């Protein structure tokens, strides 16, 4: 019951993205808790949530910004749990600057990031829920029923 | 010592890179093993690596590409297990073209991806330590106190000569 | 009556760019099959699809995909029958993944890539004909009266 | 040994790429011709060689060119035939304007495209390969046996040193 | 009467964008000629059109395509007189590959390049008029008035 | 001679870069403290660093930062001074990753951003110094003499050698 | 009652982004003019503006432009006030011009550029402000409790 | 002798790339000018030159810039005059801003410009001259016979080696 996985953005702007991954995890029955964190706007309140992230039994974080998204970046700064950063779309630059900002971190302090938008959302739920699959066999199972019910689905010509 | 990791490149040219990610997991002392599988070269055998990897006991895959770095998505389309991408530097394109080609995966299919080049490498295999730090209370904390030193060791001013 | 080129996209929203490359060889009564096969989600439907195209009779393999589509590179990699590569417009960076991720194959294994989108669909099923017409004289004569229209039919003046 | 694929660039400064092309259409035994025809410098020989190019026999047009890489695209404006073009890379902007210039081309005419610079000439010339080999099983089988070569050549592990 | 400018675009699609051109030509009452050529489509079109540009009296050509933009540079290609180009904007790519299959000319032989889309085609018709105004005292007045004008009636604050 | 001006940056690596506006700083006699922070690595000594700046006497802070470049970006989140970042040139994208990741900052928290590289260092520093001379006569005679002198340097026509 | 910031911006068409910045100034009570200066098309306006702005009593100036955005680097070029640069999304390269325009300033001559768009005006507006607040003591508090209500006011989860 | 071509720089290092402006207009006997006017450190000088252009008798102007190339555009808004913009490399981003700060001039103030680097610059000459040929029959002659000797200068075939 006590969230496994903790997903935060930016803002309420990120959450039309950010609740691909939210869907997710609920879809796989893998606790977590959604929440905003601005690392521009409540800089301790980020400290903190990352600080404390370990104590509180959180395994994932899954961080989405957009624009000069340092809210991976500088969650991953303050805790030892793999940090997962998705790259919200832009207004003008289509997340390119989104994506630069979360990817290219420096040795030392690491961000797994996924793809632009609600698809990187989506992956990052699913990777998140790949990490906890290795010491959870029960999820495992449901993670294999997902993986081989999205290959089973792909139709095999269009419609 | 069975590996726990395993880093694959499409070639020997990435090695100059992912030996970066194969020096940390030794520095942490994580079991792993190191190959190189061609994506376009070998498919067969990526396909036979990806499948088996689960059962021959490993936990996280590092795949490093470079151009249509195609490798750590076409991994990840065969296993379960989650897989990390290091985008390796490109001559003309100086890694754009790997970076894209491997962190746009569709919602589905998952690739972590890392930052272009060596420092990409470096944390691929540190988040890698940090998913079996979950599991794993003395790489825990090794991780803790190698995350620690990193933090203490940083300078107060440069040497401004 | 059997297919001489095969057209295959990672997904169904890839159809709205493919079918163009579909009219056009249908246009030229050239026989061709339409599928939907993803690198991604159907894997080894894929190295089953390119391991046997030459078997089956296949002179050209068109395929498109967006994002990090490696689609035509792994069919590719399977296959030693030409394969058109066609980059799908995606929504964030409007095709520039989908071209890298295409164009950009490594020495060894080639894929002949057109452009993004709409145009790159109707090019790759022109170029695959252009290359059937090597050597089938009455499909060669039916691409020069095509290429002679497309010619003569600019007009000289806007409207 | 007429020639069945025709390489053409715009200066002698592609050739560094384009000889990738040459080594390995000589390497599978095609026999082709290499000649420089600017597409800017001299417009009417590029129309005579494109216009001609069916008549005298070539089945494969490999054109390479930097910048606003016009050749490929103005080439197929003038032949039938399928037309491969390589975007050679350029100083400033590293081919990515010889990559825009020549596979952005407009539905109606096709220009198949590779990668940017020695790779993608080799690549062009693998491509015309797998064209003519539909046609020449002699040549197919020479193909087939240079691709399975180059899979099984690829290496297990990396020399790490 | 005769024409002494000359606007060419590579198809219907691009007269949105050099309509623009047209517009501002015949605004300072500079005689010209408005049609469609194609690099691509019509090559021996602009063959004939450029080889004989000059000696039709023609002064400046106004060349827009988008895409792989090659018709200002193979209307250079065929002519000694100056060849401005217009970078229309493209579909997936915003005019950037009209941008720089326009611009990156190797040495040897120019385009005046303007920005991408309709500000473009009005500026080349203004650079093409500047050109005209070297000779031509009366046209020479006729812009020193436009730009004067254009100057005097920006406002001082925004509405 | 206490500090009016902070340059912080992330490592010593960006020193390189940061120097010119140390230098300049120092050449307008400008007090100014030059250190080293990490947001990534140090990120309690950046919070500690930020949070107490305007109280130690600070009035501007210049931070370079390469890659992602998140220094400039978080120290503003926590001080209410004026905050002007450097992008340090990064190895495969030549400072683009740099300057993105700090000029794109949210509405709310400002980030003056200058130009990649040590133009960029020498021009946070003389922007520092236009904003210091506001309120400080001495030095916007000095800043004036500086002006004046680069315009006055300028020659009138290239040596052609 | 006297400006003590001047908004200037290239067109009308740059209001809306530069009103973000006029709003805000207003907000924080910041005596401030708002005026349309181009550099492209009036560039003696210009000139006059920025080299009698001190003299006027102005301490700051925000210049908003797009595409070859050249107006805040010109106003910086006339006078000794800090000078910050709105890059105004472009229609087709979205501020990407805007913003290279303005943030690569050579050495010498610099520009305090924020972010693409409303947000870089907004910011631009508060760059502007945090910087009378080192010689104000009541604007000072005012911003004190701006940026601490900001803080407050982000939200701890989605809506 | 009186010039008809002004050229313009920001500074003494982009002399390497306008030489070949300089080069080509002495080539084909094209009386002009060679000058140093930075937009930004002598803006009044920049004022002066643009608008005097015209009546001094000069038809033509080429300015190179880099960076935020303002030269060009600057100039052009004085001056009735066609002005051509050389965009000249940069460090970091290889010339894109400095072509992107000098092409995309809003509707209203035109720059023709060229490619970026030392091809721009020539090109730049060359469209001067294209420009003055229309009314001076003596250098059309010229220019003609330039451009027949370039196209017939190209060689039919690379030197393979």
């Given at each position: 019951?006590?969230?496994?996985?903790?997903?935060?953005?930016?803002?309420?702007?990120?959450?039309?993205?950010?609740?691909?991954?939210?869907?997710?995890?609920?879809?796989?029955?893998?606790?977590?808790?959604?929440?905003?964190?601005?690392?521009?706007?409540?800089?301790?309140?980020?400290?903190?949530?990352?600080?404390?992230?370990?104590?509180?039994?959180?395994?994932?974080?899954?961080?989405?910004?957009?624009?000069?998204?340092?809210?991976?970046?500088?969650?991953?700064?303050?805790?030892?749990?793999?940090?997962?950063?998705?790259?919200?779309?832009?207004?003008?630059?289509?997340?390119?600057?989104?994506?630069?900002?979360?990817?290219?971190?420096?040795?030392?302090?690491?961000?797994?990031?996924?793809?632009?938008?609600?698809?990187?959302?989506?992956?990052?739920?699913?990777?998140?829920?790949?990490?906890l699959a290795l010491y959870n066999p029960?999820?495992?199972?449901?993670?294999?029923?997902?993986?081989?019910?999205?290959?089973?689905?792909?139709?095999?010509?269009?419609?």
């Open positions: 019951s006590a969230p496994v996985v903790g997903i935060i953005m930016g803002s309420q702007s990120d959450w039309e993205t950010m609740r691909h991954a939210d869907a997710l995890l609920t879809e796989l029955e893998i606790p977590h808790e959604t929440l905003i964190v601005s690392a521009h706007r409540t800089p301790d309140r980020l400290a903190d949530y990352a600080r404390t992230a370990a104590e509180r039994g959180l395994n994932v974080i899954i961080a989405g910004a957009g624009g000069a998204a340092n809210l991976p970046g500088m969650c991953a700064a303050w805790t030892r749990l793999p940090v997962l950063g998705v790259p919200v779309e832009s207004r003008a630059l289509k997340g390119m600057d989104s994506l630069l900002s979360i990817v290219q971190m420096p040795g030392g302090v690491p961000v797994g990031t996924l793809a632009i938008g609600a698809s990187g959302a989506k992956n990052a739920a699913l990777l998140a829920a790949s990490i029960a999820l495992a199972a449901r993670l294999e029923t997902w993986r081989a019910l999205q290959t089973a689905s792909v139709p095999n010509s269009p419609i």
